[PDB]
Amino acid sequence: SHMRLNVVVAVSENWGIGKGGGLPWKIKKDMEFFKTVTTKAHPGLKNAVVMGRVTWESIPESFKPLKDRINIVVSSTLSHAPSFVQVVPSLNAAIDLLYNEEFSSIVDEVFIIGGYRLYKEALKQSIYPVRIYCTHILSEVDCDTYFPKVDWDKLKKVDLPDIPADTFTENGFTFKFCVYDVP
Numbered sequence: 001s002h003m004r005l006n007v008v009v010a011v012s013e014n015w016g017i018g019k020g021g022g023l024p025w026k027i028k029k030d031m032e033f034f035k036t037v038t039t040k041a042h043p044g045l046k047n048a049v050v051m052g053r054v055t056w057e058s059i060p061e062s063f064k065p066l067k068d069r070i071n072i073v074v075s076s077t078l079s080h081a082p083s084f085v086q087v088v089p090s091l092n093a094a095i096d097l098l099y100n101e102e103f104s105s106i107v108d109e110v111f112i113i114g115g116y117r118l119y120k121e122a123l124k125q126s127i128y129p130v131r132i133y134c135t136h137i138l139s140e141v142d143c144d145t146y147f148p149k150v151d152w153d154k155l156k157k158v159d160l161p162d163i164p165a166d167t168f169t170e171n172g173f174t175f176k177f178c179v180y181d182v183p
Contacts, residue, residue: 003095005128006111007119008037009147010135010175016143017116018135025060029168030135033177034113036162037133039068041108046070048107050094052115053078070103074118091121120148123182130182131158140172155180 010018010030024030041047049066053075056064065071065085072086072094081087088094091112098107111133112122122130132155137143158179167176 003110003128005122005125005130006037006109007122007130007132008034008111008113009119009132010137011147012137012139012143015147015150015152016139017114017119017145017147018137018139018143019055019058019114019145020143022060024135025058025063027135027170027173027175029170030175033133033135033163038066038111038113045108046106047109047111048072048094048098048103049111049113050074050091050118051113052118055114070098070107072097074115091118116145116148123148123150132180132182134178134180135175136178137173137175150182152180154183156183 010024012018018024024034038047038049046069048070050072051074053073056073056075056078065082070086071084072088073081074089074091074094075087076089078087086097088097095110097103098110112118132150158181160179163177163179165176167174
């Protein structure tokens with residue numbers, strides 16, 4: 001109906017972005033969360049996951065393209081992609097593509113899975129409501145690229161049944177899952 005932009009991101013204590021090394025793909029529990037959040041769609045339909053090239057490139061080969069989702073990379077560089085992965089120059093273009101004849105009968109929800117630049121564009125626009133699926137992490141090492149400014153004090157915490165509210169510890173990482181509607 002009216003598109004919500006869903007942002008999926010892992011953040012440290014100061015909303016540093018959870019990327020670099022194996023992050024966030026290497027935390028198994030976070031991948032379950034990621035897989036569930038991004039794959040679950042009304043029957044017949046598929047969610048879209050939209051991401052920058054460096055996000056696309058950071059994904060381990062065993063994982064790529066993300067099955068059962070429309071994969072869209074926003075890049076001007078990426079010359080080629082695996083069959084059925086879409087490459088477009090802009091977020092504008094990813095959304096137009098999802099509303100064009102090729103995808104509009106297929107798409108359910110849209111997730112932006114990273115790129116600082118994509119997160120930033122997604123948060124800064126004043127047209128569509130935004131929901132953030134957030135993995136909070138206590139970083140044993142520093143995350144030094146930052147998530148775009150949000151007023152977290154005003155974020156509306158969402159309760160979803162399939163989402164466990166416990167804190168988890170895997171490897172050196174302690175984390176918890178939270179879902180927010182930006183008012």
